[PDB]
Amino acid sequence: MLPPGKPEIFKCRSPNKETFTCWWRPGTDGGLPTNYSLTYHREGETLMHECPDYITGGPNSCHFGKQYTSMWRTYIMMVNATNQMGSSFSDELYVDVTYIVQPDPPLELAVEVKQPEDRKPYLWIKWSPPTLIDLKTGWFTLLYEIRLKPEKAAEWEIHFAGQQTEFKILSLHPGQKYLVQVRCKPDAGYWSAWSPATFIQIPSDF
């Protein structure tokens, strides 16, 4: 018997500056919505458009594929929640895809102990970029950070690796097991989540 509460578009994210997704939540408190419609227009245009993909991004989301995503051009978007009793509209949200970029984590993190003759031994760390990103053309640029720590240590040691996909670490404690993770961020935007840990035992004879 009640119209929906006021919905709110609470998050938008682009993993690769080529697509993006936005998510909304219902209002508490009002009736159950039976439909939502996300509409938007772009700076410089009067045309109103509907969300082109309500499926890809899962529940209460709008996914903008490559055909609908462009940088340096503000999206002005709104979501309405309707049921047979009435309707409610979110506040407008202004989105520049440029400033919502947060890559997925790096991949294939691998760690190896190297012990060369008469030179310092070292932990050799290697990884790959997230799959969705185009570094090769220069469209996207990634920076990386590694962290590692033994269990029960209070602090992670953090190493900024710049744009490399490998890294050498020298001062490690012989016999100790370390957890290592990597994360990445664009030149402009948000750090990814840390990758899952890879584990490494540093040999006693180190």
């Binding site: 080529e18 410089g44 462009s70 940088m71 340096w72 202004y94 400033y99 090769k136 053309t137 220069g138």
Partner: protein, 186 residues
């Protein structure tokens, strides 16, 4: 030495965009955070009339000489507004220090980046046409208006446009570096 020139140009363009992004964020938190200034900043950049690529596919399609030309035109077009930004702000009795410091650094570093860009063009495209065609900024009256709201909105739009164009310049330079030096295998 093209690799060294490109490397230094990209250090500058990424540093400039960083400063512009932080300037815009600091102005926004401090003056405009509470009132409809972001709605007011829709469609109103002096560089909008340039044909600029809007995605990597248009970028890839751009003739290399014209793409470099375009970066140069955007940088040349910002000389005038950056000068007035700094002049106006520095001329205040109580100049917001962090904002002023960023504006003066961007003003200075943009000149250097334009010099690096002109050297690039000289090396890669020595018979470029030396005629200028860049878009004119003429928004000084709105920066100088007594109406505090119209004035803040003029500053908002200038800073939003700066952050956008500094980003585009950086992203276009990174595209060109990778295309020129690495055949798009960076």
């Amino acid at each position: 030495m093209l690799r060294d020139l490109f490397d230094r140009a990209v250090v500058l363009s990424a540093y400039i965009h960083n400063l512009s992004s932080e300037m815009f964020s600091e102005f926004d938190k401090r003056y405009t955070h509470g009132r409809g200034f972001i709605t007011k900043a829709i469609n109103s950049c002096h560089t909008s009339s340039l044909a600029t690529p809007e995605d990597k596919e248009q970028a890839q399609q751009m003739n290399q000489k014209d793409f470099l030309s375009l970066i140069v035109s955007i940088l040349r077009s910002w000389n005038e507004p950056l000068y007035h930004l700094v002049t106006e702000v520095r001329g205040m009795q109580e100049a917001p220090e962090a904002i002023l410091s960023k504006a003066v650094e961007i003003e200075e570093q943009t000149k250097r980046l334009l010099e690096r860009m002109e050297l690039i063009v000289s090396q890669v495209h020595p018979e470029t046409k030396e005629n200028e065609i860049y878009p004119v900024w003429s928004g000084l009256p709105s920066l100088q208006m007594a109406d505090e709201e119209s004035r803040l909105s003029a500053y908002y739009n200038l800073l939003h446009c700066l952050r956008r164009d500094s980003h585009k310049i950086d992203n276009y330079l990174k595209l060109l570096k990778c295309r020129i030096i690495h055949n798009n295998n960076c």
